[PDB]
Protein: Caspase-6
Organism: Homo sapiens
Amino acid sequence: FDPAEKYKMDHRRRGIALIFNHERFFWHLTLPERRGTCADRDNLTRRFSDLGFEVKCFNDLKAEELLLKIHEVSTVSHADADCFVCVFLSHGEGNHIYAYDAKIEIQTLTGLFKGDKCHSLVGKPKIFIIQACYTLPAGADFLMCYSVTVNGSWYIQDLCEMLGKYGSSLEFTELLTLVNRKVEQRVPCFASMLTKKLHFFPKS
Amino acid sequence: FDPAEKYKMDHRRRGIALIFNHERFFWHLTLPERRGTCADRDNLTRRFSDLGFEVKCFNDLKAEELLLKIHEVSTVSHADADCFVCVFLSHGEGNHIYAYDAKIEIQTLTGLFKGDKCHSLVGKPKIFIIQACTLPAGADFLMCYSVTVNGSWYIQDLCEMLGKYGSSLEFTELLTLVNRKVEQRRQVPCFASMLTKKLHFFPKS
């Protein structure tokens, strides 16, 4: 029973990094524009591509479209993939994220990737990064990263900076730990249901 | 800016490990007895002593006594201590823990150790382990959630890991093993970290 066991990260593909980016909102929600979220979006796009991810961004989806998209991604095959990354950059009321027109419960989004529902991701890391102005990991191998101006937000800037230097070498949670320190110096948080060490060594 | 930076762990003392152990409850709460929580309590007592902690156990405190105790511990000096550990073994409705007679919000308990309120713990790890049938209060907080007569799976497996690897491994990687151990049983626990540095318990001088 090896205390230095790492997740298997030598599949054909790294996997998908889903980015839902929300800048403006339906007028009757009365939510302020999120200035520099697009900078965050692009920054995350660079960093994650560099780590081998197929990055798919969507901007300002309405609830229906977002659920369609995420449900779709939950149902393609991840059998030849290492892991899955999903990012939300929007407003958040409670355990909800905002789409363009309405709230969605985070649990209903994350639950799409639990084992009973997404077989090809079983025993692989499922990483959610949630940057929102609450929800425990959906199950085994889930990692939730919470953040708790025109050039981006502190959390995404510092996460991306760390991904840039250390992403290819460090264990991912120790890298988040650095992000905690970085941000604090200028507090964010991760919650882990991971079962092994996670690294993003460059692929063959 | 060193990515391998560890917390300073060479103070005079390791620190206190507070254990609030709850087995029976006031009748009108209608909460079932927690069988084998005493086993858990004793198991945690061994492991934490072995790691250099001054362990103080309290059994079935009523809300007033619990608050008094924890507020007291939050107000002694930790200046010559490495860190602080506090364990709750009780029932939990929401972000509440149960004392003997009532609920208490976990935030009001953790909040006592935030920097603005407990100066001698600033920049030191504050670890809460909650085993109950809330996000970290601030920097350097680590929350461990478990989410029969010989103990619970979570405490057994956490204690077994503390015993083998506690003196050696980085504490979060140790918790990760506990996630794997508990998962193997034929539930999935969790930790949430606001730690800023690597945490080790290496035997003290």
Notes: Residues 1-204 of chain A form a domain with the Rossmann fold fold (CATH 3.40.50.1460).
